[PDB]
Swiss-Prot record, chain A:
Belongs to the syntaxin family. Part of the SNARE core complex containing SNAP25, VAMP2 and STX1A; this complex constitutes the basic catalytic machinery of the complex neurotransmitter release apparatus. The SNARE complex interacts with CPLX1. Interacts with STXBP1. The interaction with STXBP1 promotes assembly of the SNARE complex. Interacts (via C-terminus) with KCNB1 (via C-terminus); the interaction increases in a calcium-dependent manner and induces a pore-independent enhancement of exocytosis in neuroendocrine cells, chromaffin cells, pancreatic beta cells and from the soma of dorsal root ganglia (DRG) neurons. The lineage of its organism: Eukaryota, Metazoa, Chordata, Craniata, Vertebrata. It comes from the Eukaryota. The record marks K63, A64 as: (Microbial infection) Cleavage. Phosphorylated by CK2. This is Syntaxin-1A. There is a cross-link at K62, K63, K66 (Glycyl lysine isopeptide (Lys-Gly) (interchain with G-Cter in SUMO)). The chain holds residues 191 to 256 of 288 of the full protein. It is found in: Cytoplasmic vesicle, Secretory vesicle, Synaptic vesicle membrane; Cell membrane; Synapse, Synaptosome. Residues 2-64 form the t-SNARE coiled-coil homology domain. Expressed predominantly in cerebral cortex, hippocampus, cerebellum, adrenal medulla and retina with weak expression detected in non-neuronal tissues.
UniProtKB/Swiss-Prot annotation, chain B:
Required for vesicle-mediated transport. Catalyzes the fusion of transport vesicles within the Golgi cisternae. Is also required for transport from the endoplasmic reticulum to the Golgi stack. Seems to function as a fusion protein required for the delivery of cargo proteins to all compartments of the Golgi stack independent of vesicle origin. Interaction with AMPAR subunit GRIA2 leads to influence GRIA2 membrane cycling. Homohexamer. Interacts with GABARAP and GABARAPL2. Interacts with GRIA2. Interacts with PLK2, leading to disrupt the interaction with GRIA2. Interacts with MUSK; may regulate MUSK endocytosis and activity. Interacts with CDK16. It comes from the Eukaryota. This is Vesicle-fusing ATPase. Belongs to the AAA ATPase family. The gene is NSF. The chain holds residues 185 to 371 of 744 of the full protein.
Amino acid sequence: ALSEIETRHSEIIKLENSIRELHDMFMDMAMLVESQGEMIDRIEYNVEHAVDYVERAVSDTKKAVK
Amino acid sequence: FEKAENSSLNLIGKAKTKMGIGGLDKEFSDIFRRAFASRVFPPEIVEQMGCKHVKGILLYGPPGCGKTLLARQIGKMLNAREPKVVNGPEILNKYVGESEANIRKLFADAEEEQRRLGANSGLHIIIFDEIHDTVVNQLLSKIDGVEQLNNILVIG
């Protein structure tokens, strides 16, 4: 009927549009989350290890009073 | 087996086993017969005959002669259930594309059933009451050609 076929296209593109950008976000996302993933790999390291430094201190102090 | 009198159940095979219209019995009989009998003989006879089934039968009458009733009845008589298709007078209502497509479209369901099961044994009856450009050609193309389009009948 033309009118519906043209109006159709109009709504389809307006749809196509909004889509492409939402995809743009994930791209930046995978780049952010990963950039943060490396910022935590060192944390886990500095943490469970700090437990060793403190554990060695609390131990020496105890054997320094008994 | 025998379908319960006046049932849409149309049985086919060998394991099987007149009102109402005032006047019009000889002419009706021959016509009813020429379209339905050629279909009716089961089933080798048609090949023995070797004639393709009729596309349509058309009736023209003076007004008030009760044409419509005869047609509904003939359709009912022909198949347990076609089940009957009625065409609006406008036929072509909706200007934009469109209507023409509708005149093509009611045909379309019947042709689709036939392609899905084509060989035997499906019949669809379509009737146009009060029968230019595209609609002329469109009806003509669907009723005959390019390929097949048989296994249905239409009365005008």
